[PDB]
């Protein structure tokens, strides 16, 4: 996270770290959506141009964390993956369209003060909240500049008008993505950066005071560049697929 600040303890209890087993390293962010399902970006698991194609036993998730590096014995939970599900129409060859994946854990995780699931938006919540100028929140342990934080970082960023998103890049964007970040004329900064991808873009609903995950950190051209924006997988647009997977393979 560029131009963010340290998270408070328990501020983002749905935050998940996707971790490579061997060698040991932070790969991506992710989020807890129930006691045995975790949401992330497809590109965190599968990106053939870089010979990335993880199997379940290659990875673990760490939940309840604050420190990037310390083993937090009394608060974090480390879980194994039972199965990875990648959207079948994930378009890594062109534009990272439908950049979404689910991971089912080998056993349910116990919730605590530090571990708690985020909500996924319904249609009306998405229609009401995903509007240009309204702000959401991105969290992660990714780099501080395009350089690693000691603890989880947070930044709030405004959703950007689709024509501005489109004009900012030559990538073919789709309705399964949205972009967020400040414009140059707003004179404020902030972005996701390397290591934050797969993590959540959340919004606090004014209707019921609950946090909803509206986006998944997907891609950007550099980090925090003027006239560039972060791109996020549109969670509501993909919710039909999320529901299909969880209904078929079991809550």
């Amino acid at each position: 996270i560029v131009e963010g600040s340290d998270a408070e303890i328990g501020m983002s209890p749905w935050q998940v770290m996707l971790f490579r087993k061997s060698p040991q390293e932070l790969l991506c962010g992710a989020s807890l959506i129930s006691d045995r399902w975790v949401l992330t970006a497809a590109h965190c698991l599968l990106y053939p141009p870089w010979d990335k194609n993880f199997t379940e036993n290659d990875l673990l998730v760490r939940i309840g964390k604050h420190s990037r590096t310390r083993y937090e014995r009394n608060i974090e939970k480390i879980s194994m993956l039972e199965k990875i599900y990648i959207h079948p129409r994930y378009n890594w060859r062109e534009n990272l369209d439908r950049d979404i994946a689910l991971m089912k854990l080998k056993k349910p995780v116990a919730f605590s003060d530090y571990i708690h699931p985020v909500c996924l938006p319904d249609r009306e919540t998405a229609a009401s909240l995903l509007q240009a100028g309204y702000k959401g929140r991105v969290t992660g342990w990714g780099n501080l500049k395009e350089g690693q934080p000691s603890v989880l970082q947070v930044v709030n960023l405004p959703i950007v008008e689709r024509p501005v998103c489109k004009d900012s890049t030559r990538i073919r964007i789709t309705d399964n993505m949205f972009c967020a970040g400040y414009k140059p004329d707003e004179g404020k900064r902030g972005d996701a950066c390397e290591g934050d991808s797969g993590g959540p873009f959340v919004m606090k609903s004014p209707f019921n005071n609950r946090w909803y995950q509206m986006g998944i950190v997907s891609w950007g051209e550099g980090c925090d560049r003027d006239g560039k924006y972060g791109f996020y997988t549109h969670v509501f647009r993909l919710k039909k697929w999320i529901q299909k997977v969880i209904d078929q393979f079991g809550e």
Partner: peptide, 30 residues
Amino acid sequence: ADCGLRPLFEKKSLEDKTERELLESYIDGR
């Protein structure tokens, strides 16, 4: 059923240091 309500914040009637920025964007952002 309990999703999105944080044990250390909403459940204790405590606000985090920047969530007001989000709420205020609903007033001023459009």
